[PDB]
Symmetry: D2
Subunit: 113 residues, 4 copies
């Protein structure tokens, strides 16, 4: 599990559940190629995206479908999505945490061995 994404709701003080997350890798032609995706769990976490063998060095984009999240709660959101773009370098485990509000998002990386 070199990559885990966790999503939090700052309005309700809870995990953000059933949030779609899409991971892309940057290809040599600068396009974004699908890499991994899923929906956050009841704990707001998304496990099992990738394996060490697949997760090579490069530039990755994590897109979080925050607009659907908010609209399903009957709340009009500001952003079209939340995006986090980063280079993976060879400590080895990346946790991407995002904290969501209708008009704000924050993202932090915790990178450990």
């Amino acid at each position: 599990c070199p990559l885990m994404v966790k999503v939090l709701d700052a309005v309700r003080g809870s995990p953000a559940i059933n949030v779609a997350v899409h991971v892309f890798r940057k290809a040599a032609d600068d396009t974004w190629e699908p890499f991994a995706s899923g929906k956050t769990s009841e704990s707001g976490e998304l496990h099992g995206l990738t394996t060490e063998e697949e997760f090579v060095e490069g530039i990755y984009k994590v897109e979080i479908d925050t607009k659907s999240y908010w609209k399903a709660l009957g709340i009009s959101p500001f952003h079209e999505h939340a995006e986090v773009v980063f280079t993976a370098n060879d400590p080895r485990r990346y946790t991407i945490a995002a904290l969501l509000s209708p008009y704000s998002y924050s993202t932090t990386a915790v990178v450990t061995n």
Copy 2:
């Protein structure tokens, strides 16, 4: 302004208006002595708390009354308030801005310190 507070509302995407702020200074005796107070304006800013002469060295507490803010809006939040405690002016006079971002279950504060 040697001491300013600015507050944003991350739910409404607006300044956080009419937020009460109480400032305290730790006294000789190690209690919190009231120092100044005010509330944020339509721009979410609070100016005119103090003066260069009055804002001497010390340990200051900026209490941001986030609970009353969310409750005045008829919303039930997590925290009682936001407290920001720092030593000020120990290397000569500086200008301090306390910036805060509020959500019902989260807040954040950052300090901008200028000479």
Copy 3:
């Protein structure tokens, strides 16, 4: 100013100065068309990106070049940049401020929207 960006540095407790910002608008064709660009001033603010007339309805991307900022300071950060994508002016003209707080391994953005 219909569109403004302000950026703070949570490490130094200062405005984030000389941060490059590129704005894009999604085009007819579904690509990102360059729209405007600038860099933050000594106050960490970026004014004069656009005009009311030019800032029509659309989907806008504000790219904040945080990597170049941390690297110009000789520091190695996590993110490539900060991207902020939103639909603007779909209910008539508004004024948008994109506020960001930066640390090497974390950033945060909030929008203040006024009428």
Copy 4:
């Protein structure tokens, strides 16, 4: 485990390890009485602070010794500490997460069953 505290370093992208945390409960005379304390673990988490039986409704203060944390890293910090003050109400598990930078701290609550 009705109360867990987690502390993150936004400068290094890591758990904030060996950070002292003190919990107090507000007494009827408005003083703060010691309640629980410890140091964050290698994951930046502090488990086992209290039990359901001890953790009654009331106002609690969590104080995080951020100044020592920064100074031990050779960094001059802005705040004297980070503090989080909240009322416990009868969902039942509170996670207090704090993200630290020299001149900033953020705190979020995740409150689940």
